[PDB]
Paper text:
Eukaryotic translation initiation factor 2B (eIF2B) is the decameric guanine nucleotide exchange factor (GEF) for the GTPase eukaryotic translation initiation factor 2 (eIF2). Upon delivery of the initiator Met-tRNAi to the site of translation initiation, bound GTP is hydrolyzed and eIF2 is released from the scanning ribosome. eIF2B catalyzes GDP-GTP exchange on eIF2, enabling rebinding of Met-tRNAi to allow for a new cycle of mRNA translation initiation. Two catalytic subcomplexes, each comprised of a γ and ε subunit, decorate the central regulatory core, which is a heterohexamer composed of two α, β and δ subunits. Curiously, the eIF2B regulatory core is related to an ancient family of homo-hexameric sugar phosphate-metabolizing enzymes, with conservation observed between eIF2Bα/β/δ and the archaeal ribose-1,5-bisphosphate isomerase (RBPI).
Motivated by our biochemical evidence that sugar phosphates are activators of eIF2B, we determined a 2.9 Å cryo-EM structure of eIF2B bound to F6P, the highest affinity identified ligand. The eIF2B-F6P complex shares the same overall architecture as previously reported eIF2B structures. F6P occupies an inter-domain cavity within each eIF2Bα monomer (chains G and H), which is the conserved metabolite binding pocket in the ancestral eIF2Bα/β/δ homologs. This pocket is on the opposite face of the eIF2B holoenzyme from the previously described ISRIB binding pocket that sits at the symmetric eIF2Bβ/δ interface. Protein-ligand interactions in the F6P pocket are mediated by both the sugar and phosphate moieties. G196, A129, Y130, E198, and N208 form H-bonds with the F6P pyranose ring, while the positively charged residues R132 and K234 coordinate the phosphate group. The 1′ position of F6P is exposed to solvent, suggesting a way by which bulkier ribonucleotides (e.g. UMP and AMP) could be accommodated in this site. Notably, we did not observe electron density for any ligands within the eIF2Bβ or eIF2Bδ metabolite pockets, despite their homology to eIF2Bα. The holoenzyme structures in the absence and presence of F6P are also strikingly similar, with global r.m.s.d. = 1.6 Å. The most prominent difference is a uniform shift in the position of both eIF2Bε subunits, wherein the β-sheet rich domain moves inwards towards the cognate eIF2Bα subunit by ~1.5–2 Å.
Residue numbers in the entry:
A (entry chain E): 179 to 187, 191 to 242, 248 to 289, 292 to 467, 470 to 520
B (entry chain K): 1 to 9, 36 to 44, 48 to 53, 75 to 78, 87 to 133, 155 to 217, 226 to 237, 240 to 243, ...
C (entry chain I): 41 to 232, 238 to 279, 285 to 466
D (entry chain D): 9 to 26, 29 to 97, 125 to 351
E (entry chain F): 179 to 187, 192 to 242, 248 to 289, 294 to 466, 471 to 520
The structure:
């Protein structure tokens, strides 16, 4: 009964083959979103926000025109894949930046697309290498770290921490159907750090040997709850039950002023056909059974009591300062 | 203007575009080099003949999603497609090789399952990216671009095919 | 009909040349049980009831070990019928010695003799029979390949092969070993068709008795590779590709290391060391965390660290402050203080004295090493060898009691 | 003999893994009935040594399959209680047989007596969430579905996706089912009203060894205070406590988790894939047995009237 | 909702010299329906007295009496749903009738009711009083709830055997039943205090132990009793005061139940409106008035069960259910 959340199966057949109302860059990006060639919460924001640099210099006139011109683009984008808060706050900053400037057209078009690289630098690039300085001192010299799935920041940590001579041992917990903990496993064995891979139902057998649980956040809600990949909340709960400290590495811009008290609000449904096992397969042609429904969540909310740290670009905050960094910023 | 359809030198091509201009509305293999002063923005070379109203939406989406360097439509020349059924790996139009379809080991280590199709009809619906027509200035390119991967007038280029 | 098998218990190469000289290849312990035990247990698990065992080189050791094994008792549902003959020189005269005695009557199942697998030949055998009877005795073999990936430790470059198959019915149109080659020459005219490199060879051909006829009339064949190559220049060979079940053949000692590390890590799950599939009393184990197996009465030392993937035999006292890992230590042996054992393989009975750093190696049975010895990767120590108290053997040094075969003698380097 | 060959056939089937748990117990009873008939034995002592030895080899064949060990211990208790009430006794060989037959009709009615208590624990417009595929729980959910109407969420167990065939079995019977991905157990826990699972083994302290997701399930159920009902009969009741000396985990091939086609990283990555997961008894609410619905804190008493304390260790 | 559990507001159909149901059983059922007899012990005593009246009027036996008085219990299940004390009383009576083999069996049966009431409802109450005398010390304050014939007996005899304690009486709407405790305490001279359930968290800071009564102890240790008991025990544990429940053995039902939803009689909803803004509640279609009679507290919220056998930790009530059967 996740009825209020859309469930999606390509929205490219009805649209005009040259430059339509939506931009070439925006249809290219939305098609990449829907097919699944960009999956990270960070990588979707860069992918949006430098395909959106392509929108600005192609646009010719500036504020009131561009603000309502950009809205069909992100309407199409949230039709392709629902926008996460890394994308949402990016668009909010973009609209504030467009409405801030006013009164030459060429100078404004150059300054917008240069202050968008400035956004990536001082909030996704310089942030992620300031998360790693704070998490390097929290990673001990002989401990075991449990990560979950692919995260661009959790894998930047404990690979920039290993190359500073720390010699931990990562354990990679993964879940179906994304199986994206392989992508954080291939790129972590290449760094040379010892690894271990196991699925999330065995997150309670491997958790006794684990010293800390390092996770990534797709959004930090304004009550301190952590919205991220589905098994994160389950993982943090079992981490608390095995009393291992659990850490969340999140940048500041992923802080949303939206508060959720459960795990059934804005938790997008992706393709239920991903749940088909291809074992032989028994769930294939699941539409033939009327009573049978398939639930494919992509996001999940862990409460702030289940998580100890939040490593942010500005200090290490105890997850109840999440409403506070939302204040001292902006 | 994301794309610019180029028609070689015919109502079936000109109204397969349900686009708004052709380079057959101004009429002016090597003809794309003679149509070069048109704005080089992701040309879509069509065919004079043997085009039968296949939907572009499945072919162009192999150029707007995967960011292919080149994208063809097919419906003596042996093609080796990847296991996903959409990636060209080994095109050999020459059947006059000495009875040996030699394959580089590097593609077989990178792409283990190469599925070979026998004599597929070439619709000549080339979705060249805008630098390939420039790279020719500095078939003829379809079996060269598949060899150029694993010439650089942009990364490693990639070429995808629809069947 | 009943299912049979042919098990060529003499490997007809000299890949283990300093080791096959004294011990036959299918007796040398993989994970403290011999290589002929994995193929025999695989044959029994598949459903084979009439295994034949062909021995030529060191047949006395093979038969003596077989009679004191699980499959020569009358309890076993897989008779062994050992055939000792010194006249063999290859797989060819072995498999054409079948028609000299007419042993098989239906489609048998030729494993090579050191196959290590948990393959279930019931889907493959039923497919082979189905396309045997339907196209009127056309297919004569069903090659069994494991869907590997070409960059794998189990895919060693000697045994690496490439195929060209029909892919609508799995039918081997071309097959060649890619021992030394950069570009693969696939002949034409086999199209009028997938090309696969992700196939581990696995040597579990399901060849029908016509193959024993095809080896018979054409005396020139010597091995299965010769037969598959020499038929595809002329009948049929099909295949079946498995994806969920392990299969490998320990041809060379690189393959030995890869398959021994795969067995310890439970990739061959019904044949893990703690399962005690050979039901001997001296090879019981307790699978602890991190794939650490310790046999009965092992008596681990104080402060010694077993990191992961360790197999310990019965009677395997370990010293103090050791860092044994990724290794197999064997039924009853003495390991001293402060040693380091990384990716090593130690057979039944060794003397590792004190502080000796043994990295990637193979210490055979009754081996001796003294204090402060620093064996480097890929070093092989054959039976009853001793290494003195100051040796640092170079990477890739074989040491045996036979100086013509090895690169050393009964003591450390540069001495006799 | 036929019987001996059938004994090692059973032992080797146990080792390789080639059936449901009730069929396991029924075959164990048939085998032990054959053992006590066809072997020659003077008095009950030699037969208890014989049954103990054969139970030791069947238990050491697959130590994580404890239904066979439980039924060996039940037969041992039957032997020492049908010899106690006669205290070489001639009719003893018959007497045990009848008790074994009375055990075999205690079996084949275990699933019906558990399913009879379905309506007392499942209400209309309920949402139930299960994990594995256990025949006891599907009969429980298919006896409550005859009268009432409810929702069932079958969270698949990830390595062997076996909740798929459970939710196919339940959707054929008209229960509106949802298949999950096993990562969403904490997510959909807020909605779920009861959790009904099955076990491989109920240990002697009320704890249970079950399918690998059940502890991650029970922690969520305890977090949201959802009652965790456990439908499990009395052959799944093993008198072993969760000691560290005996290993209760079973580990299968890592191909179930990380496939062999990964390649070179498989030489560095240590993949494990356990199939069983310890659930401590304080996360359990009820055990719906075939004899009632008693609490975990009563399980020790059910040990004392099923297995003699000399038969715990074989 | 509460669809399976029954809603009731029944003597109009039966003839005045009734022949379908016995006269005594009609009186008993209508006293249950109106509310003249309340409390599990009082209902069990009244039921057993009416059954003695039924048996002494019986003229002919083992099968006949059981299938004759099964319609009587159908009538009583219609009039007011039977609590488990009544259920075990009827089970014992049917076992007694079936146990009687081949006139004089009516006197032997009727005394077995007297041997049931004495050594399981009266002597059991005295034994529970003696055991709970130990747990009541001088100076402590005891929070009781509602009206229980056993809790008030325990308090009164603990007072008259020399203790000097104080009682807080917590009460709930709509029965307002703890007044029947409160007045009965004041006649005994016990200091008392009275307040409703919402104020319980106000006085659980001062309370030393919470002494409740049980209408049935189930087969897992859950205590089925009056609707405020589980909530009161939860707040009692949140203020870390011990919770004692005083239950006789014969109220132990082998039925098991987790949540407070399976077997919970509903009294008529018309009791709920207080002096009004709710009198016209039938005409509001969306509005439904719900009052449960019973709920279950889990055994982790109860620290002690006092029983005529002894003091048991509420997780070993299946022990007593075993040793009495």
């Amino acid at each position: 009964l996740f009825s209020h959340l859309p469930q999606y199966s390509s929205l490219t057949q009805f649209m005009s083959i040259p430059s339509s109302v939506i931009h070439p860059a925006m249809v290219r990006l939305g098609l990449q979103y829907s097919q699944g060639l960009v999956s990270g919460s960070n990588a979707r924001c860069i992918a949006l926000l430098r395909a959106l640099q392509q929108v600005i210099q192609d646009y010719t006139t500036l504020s009131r025109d561009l603000v309502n011109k950009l809205k069909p683009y992100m309407s199409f984008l949230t039709q392709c894949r629902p926008l996460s808060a890394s994308m949402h706050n990016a668009i909010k900053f973009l609209n504030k930046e467009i409405t801030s400037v006013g009164s030459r057209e060429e100078e404004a078009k150059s300054e917008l697309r240069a202050a968008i690289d400035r956004y990536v630098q001082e909030k996704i690039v310089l942030a992620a290498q300031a998360i790693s300085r704070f998490a390097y001192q929290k990673i001990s010299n002989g401990d075991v770290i449990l990560v979950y799935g692919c995260s661009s920041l959790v894998s930047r940590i404990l690979q920039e921490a290993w190359t500073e001579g720390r010699r931990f041992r990562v354990v990679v917990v993964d879940s179906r159907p994304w199986l994206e903990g392989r992508h954080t496993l291939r790129s972590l064995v290449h760094a040379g750090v010892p690894a271990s891979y196991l699925l999330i139902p065995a997150a309670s057998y491997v958790l006794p040997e684990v010293s800390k649980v390092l996770l990534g956040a797709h959004a930090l809600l304004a009550n301190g709850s952590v919205m991220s990949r589905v098994g994160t909340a389950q993982l943090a709960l079992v981490a608390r039950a095995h009393n291992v400290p659990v850490l969340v590495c999140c940048e500041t811009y992923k802080f949303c002023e939206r508060v959720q008290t459960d795990a059934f609000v804005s938790n997008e449904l992706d393709d239920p056909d991903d749940l088909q096992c291809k074992r032989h397969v028994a769930l294939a042609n699941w539409q033939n059974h009327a009573s049978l429904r398939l639930l494919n969540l992509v996001y999940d909310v862990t409460p702030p009591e289940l998580v100890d740290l939040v490593i942010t670009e500005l200090g290490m905050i105890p997850c109840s300062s999440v409403p506070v960094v939302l204040r001292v910023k902006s | 203007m994301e794309f610019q359809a180029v028609v070689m030198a015919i109502w079936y091509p000109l109204n397969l575009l349900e686009f708004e201009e052709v380079i057959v509305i101004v009429c002016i293999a090597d003809s794309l080099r003679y149509i070069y002063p048109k704005l080089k923005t992701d040309v879509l070379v069509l065919s004079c003949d043997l085009i039968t109203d296949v939907a572009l939406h499945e072919v162009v989406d192999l150029f707007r999603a995967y960011d292919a360097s080149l994208a063809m439509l097919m419906r003596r020349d042996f093609i080796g497609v990847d296991s996903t059924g959409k990636r060209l790996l080994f095109m050999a139009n020459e059947a006059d090789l000495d009875e040996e379809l030699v394959i580089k080991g590097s593609i077989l280590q990178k792409h283990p399952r190469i599925r070979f199709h026998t004599g597929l009809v070439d619709a000549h619906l080339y979705c060249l990216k805008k630098y390939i027509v420039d790279f020719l200035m500095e078939s003829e390119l379809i079996p060269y671009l598949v060899r150029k991967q694993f010439a650089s007038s942009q990364k490693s280029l990639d070429i995808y095919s629809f069947i | 009909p009943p299912l049979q098998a042919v098990l060529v218990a003499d490997s007809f190469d000299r890949r283990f040349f300093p080791i096959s000289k004294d011990q036959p290849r299918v007796l040398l312990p993989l994970a403290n049980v011999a290589l002929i035990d994995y193929t025999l247990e695989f044959l029994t698990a598949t459903g084979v009831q009439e295994t034949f065992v062909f021995c030529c080189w060191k047949a006395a050791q093979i038969k003596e070990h077989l009679l004191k094994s699980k499959w020569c008792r009358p309890t076993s549902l897989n008779v062994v019928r050992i055939i000792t003959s010194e006249l063999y020189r290859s797989l060819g005269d072995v498999l054409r010695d079948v028609d000299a005695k007419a042993l098989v009557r239906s489609d048998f199942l030729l494993v090579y003799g050191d196959v290590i697998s948990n393959i279930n030949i019931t889907r493959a055998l039923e497919e082979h029979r189905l396309r045997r009877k339907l196209e009127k005795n056309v297919s004569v073999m069903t090659m069994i390949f494991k869907e590997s990936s070409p960059s794998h430790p189990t895919r060693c470059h000697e045994d690496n092969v490439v195929v060209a198959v029909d892919s609508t019915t799995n039918r081997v149109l071309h097959f060649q070993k890619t021992q030394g080659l950069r570009r693969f020459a696939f002949p034409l005219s086999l199209f009028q068709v997938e090309v696969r490199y992700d196939l581990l060879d696995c040597h579990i051909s399901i060849c029908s008795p016509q193959v024993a006829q095809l080896f018979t009339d054409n005396f020139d064949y010597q091995t299965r590779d010769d037969f598959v190559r020499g038929l595809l220049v002329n009948n049929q060979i099909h295949m079946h590709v498995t994806a969920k079940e392990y299969g490998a053949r320990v041809s060379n000692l690189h393959m030995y290391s890869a398959v021994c590390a795969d067995v310890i890590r439970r990739w061959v799950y019904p044949l893990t060391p703690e399962a005690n599939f050979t039901d001997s009393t001296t090879q019981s184990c307790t699978h602890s965390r991190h794939n650490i197996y310790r046999g009965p009465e092992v008596s681990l030392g104080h402060g010694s660290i077993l990191e992961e993937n360790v197999l310990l035999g019965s009677g395997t006292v370990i010293g103090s402050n050791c860092f044994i890992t990724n290794s197999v230590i064997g039924p009853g042996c003495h390991i001293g203080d402060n040693v380091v054992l990384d990716q090593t393989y130690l057979w039944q009975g060794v003397r590792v004295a004190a502080g000796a750093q043994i990295h990637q190696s193979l210490l055979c049975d009754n081996a001796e090493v003294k204090e402060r010895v620093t064996l480097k990767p890929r070093s092989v120590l054959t039976s009853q060898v001793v290494v003195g108290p100051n040796i640092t053997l170079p990477e890739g040094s074989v040491i045996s009691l036979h100086p013509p075969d090895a690169e050393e003698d009964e003591d450390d380097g540069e001495f006799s | 003999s036929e019987l001996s060959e059938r004994i090692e056939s059973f032992v080797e089937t146990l080792k390789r893994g080639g059936r449901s748990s009730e069929e396991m117990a029924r075959e164990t009873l048939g085998l032990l009935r054959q053992i006590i008939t066809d072997h020659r034995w003077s008095n009950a002592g030699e037969l208890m040594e014989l049954i103990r030895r054969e139970g030791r080899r069947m238990t050491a064949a697959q130590p994580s399959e404890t239904t066979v060990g439980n039924m060996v211990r039940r037969v041992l208790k039957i032997i020492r209680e049908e010899y106690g009430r006669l205290h070489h006794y001639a009719q003893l060989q018959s007497n045990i047989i009848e008790a074994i037959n009375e055990l075999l009709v205690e079996l084949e009615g275990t699933m019906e007596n558990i399913a009879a208590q379905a309506l007392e624990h499942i209400h209309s417009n309920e949402v139930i969430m299960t994990i594995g595929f256990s025949r006891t729980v599907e009969a429980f959910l298919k006896e409550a579905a005859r009268k009432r109407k409810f929702h069932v969420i079958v969270a698949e167990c990830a390595p062997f996706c076996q909740g798929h065939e459970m939710a196919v079995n339940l959707s054929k019977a008209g229960i509106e089912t949802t298949v999950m991905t096993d990562a969403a157990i904490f997510a959909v826990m807020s909605r779920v009203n009861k959790v009904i699972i099955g076990t491989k083994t109920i240990l002697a302290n009320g704890a249970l060894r079950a399918v690998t997701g059940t502890h991650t399930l029970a922690l969520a159920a305890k977090h949201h205070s959802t009652p965790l009902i456990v439908c499990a009969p009395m052959f799944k009741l093993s008198p072993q406590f969760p000691n560290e000396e005996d290993s209760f985990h079973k580990f299968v091939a890592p191909e179930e988790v990380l496939p062999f086609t990964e390649g070179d990283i498989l030489e560095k990555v240590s993949v494990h894939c356990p199939v069983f997961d310890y659930v401590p008894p304080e996360l359990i609410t009820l055990f719906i047995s075939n004899i009632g619905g008693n609490a975990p804190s009563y399980i020790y008493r059910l040990m004392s009237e099923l297995y003699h304390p000399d038969d715990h260790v074989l």
